[PDB]
PDB file of C-alpha atoms in Angstrom:
ATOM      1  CA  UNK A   1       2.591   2.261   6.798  1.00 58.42           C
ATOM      2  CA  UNK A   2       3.247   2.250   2.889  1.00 56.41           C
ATOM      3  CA  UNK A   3       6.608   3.117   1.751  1.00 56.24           C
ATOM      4  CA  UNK A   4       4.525   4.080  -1.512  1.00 54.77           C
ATOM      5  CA  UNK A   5       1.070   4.288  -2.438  1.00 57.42           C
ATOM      6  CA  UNK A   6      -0.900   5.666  -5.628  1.00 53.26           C
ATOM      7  CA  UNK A   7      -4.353   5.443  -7.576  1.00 56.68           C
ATOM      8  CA  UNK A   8      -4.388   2.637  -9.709  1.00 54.70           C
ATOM      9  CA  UNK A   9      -6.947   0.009 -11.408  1.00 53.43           C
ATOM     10  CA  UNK A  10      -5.075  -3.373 -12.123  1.00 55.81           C
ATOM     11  CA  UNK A  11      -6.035  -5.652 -15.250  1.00 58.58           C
ATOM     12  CA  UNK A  12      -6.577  -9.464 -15.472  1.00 58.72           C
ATOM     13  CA  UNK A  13      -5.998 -11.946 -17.861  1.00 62.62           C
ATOM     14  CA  UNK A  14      -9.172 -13.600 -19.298  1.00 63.80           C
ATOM     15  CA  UNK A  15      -8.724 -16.442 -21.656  1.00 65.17           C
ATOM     16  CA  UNK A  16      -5.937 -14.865 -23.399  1.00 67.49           C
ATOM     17  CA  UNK A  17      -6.660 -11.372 -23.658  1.00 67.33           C
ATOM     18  CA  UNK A  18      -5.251  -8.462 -21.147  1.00 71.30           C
ATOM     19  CA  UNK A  19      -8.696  -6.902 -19.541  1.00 71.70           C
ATOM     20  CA  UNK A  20      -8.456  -3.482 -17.482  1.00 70.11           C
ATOM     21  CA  UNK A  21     -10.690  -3.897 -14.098  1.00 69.69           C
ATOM     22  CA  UNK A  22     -12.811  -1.022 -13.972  1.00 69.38           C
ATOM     23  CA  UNK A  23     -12.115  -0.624  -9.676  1.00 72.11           C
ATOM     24  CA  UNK A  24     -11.024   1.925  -8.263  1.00 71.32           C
ATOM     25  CA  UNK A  25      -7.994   0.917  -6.395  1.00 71.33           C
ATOM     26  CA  UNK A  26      -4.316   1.534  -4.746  1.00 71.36           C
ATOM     27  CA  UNK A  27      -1.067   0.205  -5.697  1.00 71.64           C
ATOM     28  CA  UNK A  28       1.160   0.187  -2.673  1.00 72.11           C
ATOM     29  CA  UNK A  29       4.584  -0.910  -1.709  1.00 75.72           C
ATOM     30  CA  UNK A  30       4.922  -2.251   2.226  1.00 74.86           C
ATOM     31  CA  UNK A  31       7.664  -3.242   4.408  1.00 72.59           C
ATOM     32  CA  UNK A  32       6.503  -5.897   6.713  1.00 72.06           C
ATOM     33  CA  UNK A  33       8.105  -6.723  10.381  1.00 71.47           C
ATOM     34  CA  UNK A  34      10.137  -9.835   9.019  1.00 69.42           C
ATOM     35  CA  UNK A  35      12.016  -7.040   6.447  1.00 72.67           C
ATOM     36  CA  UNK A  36      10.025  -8.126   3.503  1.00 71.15           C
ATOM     37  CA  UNK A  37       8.920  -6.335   0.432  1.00 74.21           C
ATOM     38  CA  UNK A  38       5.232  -6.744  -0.531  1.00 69.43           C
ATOM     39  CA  UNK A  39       4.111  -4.791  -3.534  1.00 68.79           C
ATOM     40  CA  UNK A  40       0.252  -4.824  -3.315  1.00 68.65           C
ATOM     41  CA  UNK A  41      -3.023  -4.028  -5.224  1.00 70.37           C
ATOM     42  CA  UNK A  42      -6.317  -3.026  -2.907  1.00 67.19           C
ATOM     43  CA  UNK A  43      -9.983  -2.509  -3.608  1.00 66.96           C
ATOM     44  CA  UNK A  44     -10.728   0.749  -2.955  1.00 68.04           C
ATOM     45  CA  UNK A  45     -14.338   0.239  -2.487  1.00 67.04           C
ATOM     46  CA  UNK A  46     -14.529  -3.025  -0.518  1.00 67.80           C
ATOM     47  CA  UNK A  47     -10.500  -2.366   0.937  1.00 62.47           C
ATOM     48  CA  UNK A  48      -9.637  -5.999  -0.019  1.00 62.08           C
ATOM     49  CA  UNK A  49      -5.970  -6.487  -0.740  1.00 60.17           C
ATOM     50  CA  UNK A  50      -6.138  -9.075  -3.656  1.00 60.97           C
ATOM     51  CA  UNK A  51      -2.716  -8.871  -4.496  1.00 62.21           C
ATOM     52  CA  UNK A  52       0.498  -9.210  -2.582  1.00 62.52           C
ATOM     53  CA  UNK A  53       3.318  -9.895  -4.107  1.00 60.10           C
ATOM     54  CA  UNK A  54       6.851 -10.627  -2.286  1.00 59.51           C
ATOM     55  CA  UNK A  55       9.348  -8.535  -4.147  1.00 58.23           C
ATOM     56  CA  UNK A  56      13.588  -8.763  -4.151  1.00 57.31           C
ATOM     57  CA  UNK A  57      15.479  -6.683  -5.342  1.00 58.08           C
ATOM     58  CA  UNK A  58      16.081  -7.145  -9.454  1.00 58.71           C
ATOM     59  CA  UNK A  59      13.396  -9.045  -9.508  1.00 55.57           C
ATOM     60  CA  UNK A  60      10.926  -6.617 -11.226  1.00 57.50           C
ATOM     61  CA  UNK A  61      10.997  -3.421 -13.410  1.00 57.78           C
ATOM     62  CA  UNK A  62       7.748  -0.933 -13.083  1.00 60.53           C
ATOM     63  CA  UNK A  63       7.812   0.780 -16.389  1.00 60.19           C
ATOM     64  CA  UNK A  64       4.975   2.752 -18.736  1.00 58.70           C
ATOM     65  CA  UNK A  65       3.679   1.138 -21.611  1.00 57.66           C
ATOM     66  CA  UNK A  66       4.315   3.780 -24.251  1.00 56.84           C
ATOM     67  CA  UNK A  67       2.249   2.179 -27.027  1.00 53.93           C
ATOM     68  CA  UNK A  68      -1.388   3.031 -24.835  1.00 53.90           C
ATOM     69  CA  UNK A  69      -2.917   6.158 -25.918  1.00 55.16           C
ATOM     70  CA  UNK A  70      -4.024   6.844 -22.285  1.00 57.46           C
ATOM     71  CA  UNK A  71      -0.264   7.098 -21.617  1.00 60.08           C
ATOM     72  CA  UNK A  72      -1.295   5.716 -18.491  1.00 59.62           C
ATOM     73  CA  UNK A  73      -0.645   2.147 -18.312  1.00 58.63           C
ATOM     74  CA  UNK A  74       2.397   0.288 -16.419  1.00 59.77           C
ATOM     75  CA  UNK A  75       3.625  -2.920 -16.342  1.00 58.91           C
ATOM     76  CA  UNK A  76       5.172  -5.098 -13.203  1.00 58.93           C
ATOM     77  CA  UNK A  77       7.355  -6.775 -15.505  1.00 60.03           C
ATOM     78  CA  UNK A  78       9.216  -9.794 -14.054  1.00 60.81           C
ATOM     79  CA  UNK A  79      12.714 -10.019 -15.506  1.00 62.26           C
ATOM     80  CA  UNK A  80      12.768 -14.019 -15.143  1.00 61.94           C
ATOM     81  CA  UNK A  81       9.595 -15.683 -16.468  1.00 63.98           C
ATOM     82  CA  UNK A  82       7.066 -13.649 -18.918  1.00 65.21           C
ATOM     83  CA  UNK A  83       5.337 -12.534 -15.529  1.00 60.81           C
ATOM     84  CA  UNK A  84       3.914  -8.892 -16.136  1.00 60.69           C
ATOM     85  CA  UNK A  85       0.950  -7.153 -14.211  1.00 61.67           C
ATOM     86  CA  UNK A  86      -0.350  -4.145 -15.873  1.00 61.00           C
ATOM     87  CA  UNK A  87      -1.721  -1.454 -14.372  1.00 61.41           C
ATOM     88  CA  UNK A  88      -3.158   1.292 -15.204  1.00 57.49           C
ATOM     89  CA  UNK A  89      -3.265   5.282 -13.251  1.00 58.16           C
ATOM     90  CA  UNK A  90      -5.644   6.499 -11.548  1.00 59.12           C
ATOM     91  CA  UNK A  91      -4.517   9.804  -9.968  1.00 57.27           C
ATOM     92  CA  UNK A  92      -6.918  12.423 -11.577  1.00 61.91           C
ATOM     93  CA  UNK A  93      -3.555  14.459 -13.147  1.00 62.70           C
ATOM     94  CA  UNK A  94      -1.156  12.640 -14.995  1.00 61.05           C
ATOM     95  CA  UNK A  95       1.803  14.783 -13.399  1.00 62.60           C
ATOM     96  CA  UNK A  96       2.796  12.554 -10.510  1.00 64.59           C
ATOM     97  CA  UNK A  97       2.589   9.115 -12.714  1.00 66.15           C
ATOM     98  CA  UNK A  98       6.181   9.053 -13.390  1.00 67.57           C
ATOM     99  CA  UNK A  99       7.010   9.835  -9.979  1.00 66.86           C
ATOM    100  CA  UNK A 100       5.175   6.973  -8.938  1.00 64.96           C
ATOM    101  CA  UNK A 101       7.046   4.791 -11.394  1.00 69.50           C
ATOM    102  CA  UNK A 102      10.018   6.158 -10.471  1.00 71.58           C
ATOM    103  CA  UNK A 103       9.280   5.643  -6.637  1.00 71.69           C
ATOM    104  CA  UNK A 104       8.057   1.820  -7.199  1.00 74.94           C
ATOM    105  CA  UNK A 105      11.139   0.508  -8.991  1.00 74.70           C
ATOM    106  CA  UNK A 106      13.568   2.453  -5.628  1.00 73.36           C
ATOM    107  CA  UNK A 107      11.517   0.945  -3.151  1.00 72.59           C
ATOM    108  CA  UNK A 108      11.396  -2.688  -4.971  1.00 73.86           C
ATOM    109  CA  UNK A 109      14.894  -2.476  -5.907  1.00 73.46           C
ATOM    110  CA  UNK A 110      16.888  -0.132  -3.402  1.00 72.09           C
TER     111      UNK A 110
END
């Protein structure tokens, strides 16, 4: 099962511009049988997982991007390389999102 899971659309880069994906989807964080972290993104609609990411520990910091006036948009940000994923929340109330945050970065990094 999911060590963590939430309501989340993810964005893509197209060209060179940052594009939110309109899906409906789910963030979640899963420990598979080999011990290893995946931090995921799935389709809500169609349940495709179309991203899986193998995460170590320090390797990534989930943080809100303050400068959104939704409030609601993270970043995956990779602290070696320029790698970020943004994401943005889902979850009808905004009172869990920093929960979430909070639970992402202890399950990727503790």
């Amino acid at each position: 099962k999911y060590l963590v899971e939430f309501r989340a659309g993810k964005m893509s880069l197209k060209g060179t511009t940052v594009t939110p994906d309109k899906r409906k989807g789910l963030v979640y964080i899963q420990q598979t049988d080999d011990s290893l972290i995946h931090f995921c993104w799935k389709d809500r609609t169609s349940g495709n997982v179309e991203d899986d990411l193998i995460i170590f520990p320090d390797d990534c910091e989930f943080k809100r991007v303050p400068q959104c006036p939704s409030g609601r948009v993270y970043v995956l940000k990779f602290k070696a390389g320029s790698k970020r994923l943004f994401f943005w929340m889902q979850e009808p109330k905004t009172d869990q999102d920093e929960e979430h945050c909070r639970k992402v970065n202890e399950y990727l990094n503790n």
